[PDB]
Nucleic acid binder design. Structure first.
Ligand SMILES: Nc1ccccc1NC(=O)CCC/C=C/CC(=O)Nc1ccccc1
Lengths: 71, 71
DNA sequence: AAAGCTATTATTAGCTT
DNA sequence: TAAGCTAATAATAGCTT
Protein backbone atom coordinates (compact mmCIF):
# COMPACT_ATOMS: atom_id res chain seq x y z
CA UNK A 1 0.00 0.00 0.00
CA UNK A 2 0.91 3.68 -0.19
CA UNK A 3 2.01 3.40 3.43
CA UNK A 4 2.75 0.49 5.72
CA UNK A 5 0.07 0.14 8.39
CA UNK A 6 0.00 -1.43 11.81
CA UNK A 7 -2.24 -4.35 12.64
CA UNK A 8 -4.77 -2.77 14.97
CA UNK A 9 -8.56 -2.29 14.92
CA UNK A 10 -9.54 0.44 12.46
CA UNK A 11 -11.54 3.00 14.40
CA UNK A 12 -13.32 4.64 11.44
CA UNK A 13 -16.41 2.63 10.44
CA UNK A 14 -16.08 3.92 6.87
CA UNK A 15 -12.46 2.85 6.24
CA UNK A 16 -13.15 -0.29 8.25
CA UNK A 17 -15.97 -1.39 5.98
CA UNK A 18 -13.84 -0.65 2.89
CA UNK A 19 -10.79 -2.48 4.19
CA UNK A 20 -13.02 -5.36 5.18
CA UNK A 21 -14.44 -5.72 1.66
CA UNK A 22 -11.01 -5.57 0.00
CA UNK A 23 -9.30 -8.00 2.39
CA UNK A 24 -12.26 -10.44 2.59
CA UNK A 25 -11.99 -10.88 -1.14
CA UNK A 26 -8.19 -11.26 -0.79
CA UNK A 27 -8.65 -13.86 1.95
CA UNK A 28 -11.14 -15.98 -0.01
CA UNK A 29 -8.97 -15.77 -3.10
CA UNK A 30 -5.99 -17.29 -1.25
CA UNK A 31 -8.15 -19.89 0.50
CA UNK A 32 -9.44 -21.02 -2.94
CA UNK A 33 -5.92 -21.05 -4.43
CA UNK A 34 -4.68 -23.15 -1.52
CA UNK A 35 -7.53 -25.64 -1.96
CA UNK A 36 -6.70 -26.10 -5.66
CA UNK A 37 -2.91 -25.99 -5.57
CA UNK A 38 -2.57 -28.42 -2.68
CA UNK A 39 -5.76 -30.44 -2.93
CA UNK A 40 -7.37 -29.83 0.46
CA UNK A 41 -10.79 -29.25 2.04
CA UNK A 42 -11.11 -25.77 3.45
CA UNK A 43 -13.79 -23.87 5.33
CA UNK A 44 -13.75 -20.19 6.15
CA UNK A 45 -16.52 -18.60 8.21
CA UNK A 46 -16.50 -14.83 8.72
CA UNK A 47 -18.85 -12.56 10.68
CA UNK A 48 -18.14 -8.86 10.22
CA UNK A 49 -18.48 -6.37 13.10
CA UNK A 50 -22.17 -5.86 12.24
CA UNK A 51 -22.69 -9.62 12.70
CA UNK A 52 -23.36 -10.36 9.03
CA UNK A 53 -22.12 -13.81 7.94
CA UNK A 54 -19.75 -14.46 5.03
CA UNK A 55 -18.44 -17.87 4.08
CA UNK A 56 -16.31 -19.94 1.75
CA UNK A 57 -15.88 -23.70 1.51
CA UNK A 58 -14.13 -25.95 -1.01
CA UNK A 59 -17.22 -28.17 -0.78
CA UNK A 60 -20.54 -28.08 1.06
CA UNK A 61 -19.93 -26.38 4.42
CA UNK A 62 -21.96 -29.04 6.20
CA UNK A 63 -19.40 -31.63 5.13
CA UNK A 64 -16.20 -29.84 6.18
CA UNK A 65 -17.81 -29.19 9.55
CA UNK A 66 -18.92 -32.77 10.25
CA UNK A 67 -15.48 -33.98 9.25
CA UNK A 68 -14.17 -31.57 11.88
CA UNK A 69 -16.50 -32.76 14.65
CA UNK A 70 -16.11 -36.42 13.67
CA UNK A 71 -12.35 -35.78 13.81
CA UNK B 1 7.47 -15.50 -7.28
CA UNK B 2 10.27 -16.13 -9.77
CA UNK B 3 7.60 -17.14 -12.27
CA UNK B 4 3.85 -16.68 -12.41
CA UNK B 5 2.07 -19.98 -11.91
CA UNK B 6 -1.35 -21.27 -12.85
CA UNK B 7 -3.91 -22.28 -10.27
CA UNK B 8 -4.03 -26.04 -10.71
CA UNK B 9 -3.34 -29.04 -8.44
CA UNK B 10 0.40 -29.51 -7.97
CA UNK B 11 1.22 -33.05 -9.05
CA UNK B 12 4.53 -33.43 -7.20
CA UNK B 13 3.94 -34.45 -3.56
CA UNK B 14 7.20 -32.79 -2.57
CA UNK B 15 6.53 -29.31 -4.02
CA UNK B 16 2.92 -29.71 -2.96
CA UNK B 17 3.81 -30.20 0.68
CA UNK B 18 6.20 -27.22 0.55
CA UNK B 19 3.72 -24.91 -1.17
CA UNK B 20 1.09 -26.01 1.30
CA UNK B 21 3.24 -25.07 4.31
CA UNK B 22 4.16 -21.66 2.87
CA UNK B 23 0.62 -20.71 1.78
CA UNK B 24 -1.09 -22.10 4.92
CA UNK B 25 0.98 -19.74 6.99
CA UNK B 26 0.17 -16.91 4.53
CA UNK B 27 -3.54 -17.73 4.73
CA UNK B 28 -3.65 -17.76 8.56
CA UNK B 29 -1.65 -14.54 8.67
CA UNK B 30 -4.25 -12.71 6.54
CA UNK B 31 -7.17 -14.27 8.42
CA UNK B 32 -5.65 -12.96 11.69
CA UNK B 33 -4.98 -9.49 10.23
CA UNK B 34 -8.57 -9.31 8.97
CA UNK B 35 -9.92 -10.26 12.40
CA UNK B 36 -7.91 -7.48 14.09
CA UNK B 37 -8.20 -4.72 11.50
CA UNK B 38 -11.95 -5.09 11.03
CA UNK B 39 -13.05 -6.57 14.35
CA UNK B 40 -14.67 -9.84 13.24
CA UNK B 41 -15.00 -13.47 14.32
CA UNK B 42 -13.26 -15.80 11.92
CA UNK B 43 -12.86 -19.55 11.66
CA UNK B 44 -10.63 -21.38 9.21
CA UNK B 45 -10.56 -25.19 9.09
CA UNK B 46 -8.06 -26.89 6.77
CA UNK B 47 -7.44 -30.57 6.04
CA UNK B 48 -4.42 -31.23 3.85
CA UNK B 49 -4.40 -33.97 1.20
CA UNK B 50 -3.16 -36.49 3.79
CA UNK B 51 -6.25 -35.67 5.89
CA UNK B 52 -4.35 -33.93 8.69
CA UNK B 53 -6.33 -31.09 10.31
CA UNK B 54 -5.10 -27.50 10.68
CA UNK B 55 -7.15 -24.70 12.14
CA UNK B 56 -7.36 -21.05 13.11
CA UNK B 57 -10.06 -19.16 14.97
CA UNK B 58 -10.25 -15.62 16.38
CA UNK B 59 -11.82 -17.23 19.47
CA UNK B 60 -12.58 -20.79 20.62
CA UNK B 61 -13.27 -22.72 17.40
CA UNK B 62 -16.46 -24.17 18.82
CA UNK B 63 -17.98 -20.79 19.59
CA UNK B 64 -17.73 -19.54 15.99
CA UNK B 65 -19.29 -22.80 14.84
CA UNK B 66 -22.25 -22.69 17.23
CA UNK B 67 -22.84 -19.13 16.07
CA UNK B 68 -22.88 -20.41 12.50
CA UNK B 69 -25.39 -23.20 13.13
CA UNK B 70 -27.52 -21.01 15.40
CA UNK B 71 -27.44 -18.45 12.57
C1' DA C 1 18.33 -32.35 1.84
C1' DA C 2 15.80 -28.59 3.53
C1' DA C 3 16.38 -24.02 5.41
C1' DG C 4 16.61 -19.68 3.65
C1' DC C 5 17.14 -16.04 -0.32
C1' DT C 6 15.52 -12.94 -3.93
C1' DA C 7 13.57 -11.78 -8.14
C1' DT C 8 9.26 -11.51 -9.21
C1' DT C 9 4.30 -11.41 -9.00
C1' DA C 10 0.32 -10.24 -5.89
C1' DT C 11 -2.09 -7.32 -2.66
C1' DT C 12 -3.35 -3.23 -0.92
C1' DA C 13 -3.52 1.88 1.60
C1' DG C 14 -4.12 6.07 0.36
C1' DC C 15 -5.34 8.82 -3.11
C1' DT C 16 -7.97 10.53 -7.18
C1' DT C 17 -11.89 11.99 -10.01
C1' DT D 1 -19.27 9.83 -3.17
C1' DA D 2 -17.61 5.49 -4.31
C1' DA D 3 -15.40 3.18 -8.12
C1' DG D 4 -10.97 2.57 -9.51
C1' DC D 5 -5.75 3.70 -9.72
C1' DT D 6 -0.87 3.27 -8.41
C1' DA D 7 2.84 3.76 -5.46
C1' DA D 8 4.25 0.92 -2.26
C1' DT D 9 4.37 -3.07 0.87
C1' DA D 10 3.68 -8.24 1.08
C1' DA D 11 3.88 -12.91 -0.39
C1' DT D 12 5.92 -16.40 -2.85
C1' DA D 13 8.13 -19.73 -6.76
C1' DG D 14 12.14 -21.08 -7.97
C1' DC D 15 16.73 -21.05 -6.84
C1' DT D 16 20.74 -21.46 -3.72
C1' DT D 17 23.85 -23.70 -0.55
N1 LIG E 1 -25.43 -27.63 2.40
C1 LIG E 1 -24.60 -26.51 2.07
C2 LIG E 1 -24.38 -26.18 0.74
C3 LIG E 1 -23.58 -25.09 0.40
C4 LIG E 1 -22.99 -24.34 1.41
C5 LIG E 1 -23.21 -24.67 2.74
C6 LIG E 1 -24.01 -25.76 3.08
N2 LIG E 1 -24.20 -26.10 4.46
C7 LIG E 1 -25.03 -25.32 5.35
O1 LIG E 1 -25.73 -24.42 4.89
C8 LIG E 1 -25.17 -25.73 6.78
C9 LIG E 1 -24.02 -26.45 7.44
C10 LIG E 1 -24.33 -27.48 8.49
C11 LIG E 1 -23.22 -27.92 9.39
C12 LIG E 1 -23.00 -29.39 9.63
C13 LIG E 1 -22.11 -29.81 10.75
C14 LIG E 1 -22.23 -29.08 12.06
O2 LIG E 1 -23.34 -28.74 12.44
N3 LIG E 1 -21.06 -28.79 12.85
C15 LIG E 1 -21.10 -28.02 14.07
C16 LIG E 1 -22.21 -27.23 14.39
C17 LIG E 1 -22.24 -26.48 15.56
C18 LIG E 1 -21.15 -26.50 16.43
C19 LIG E 1 -20.04 -27.28 16.12
C20 LIG E 1 -20.02 -28.03 14.94
Amino acid sequence: GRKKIQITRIMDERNRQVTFTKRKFGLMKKAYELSVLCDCEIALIIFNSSNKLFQYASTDMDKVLLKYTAY
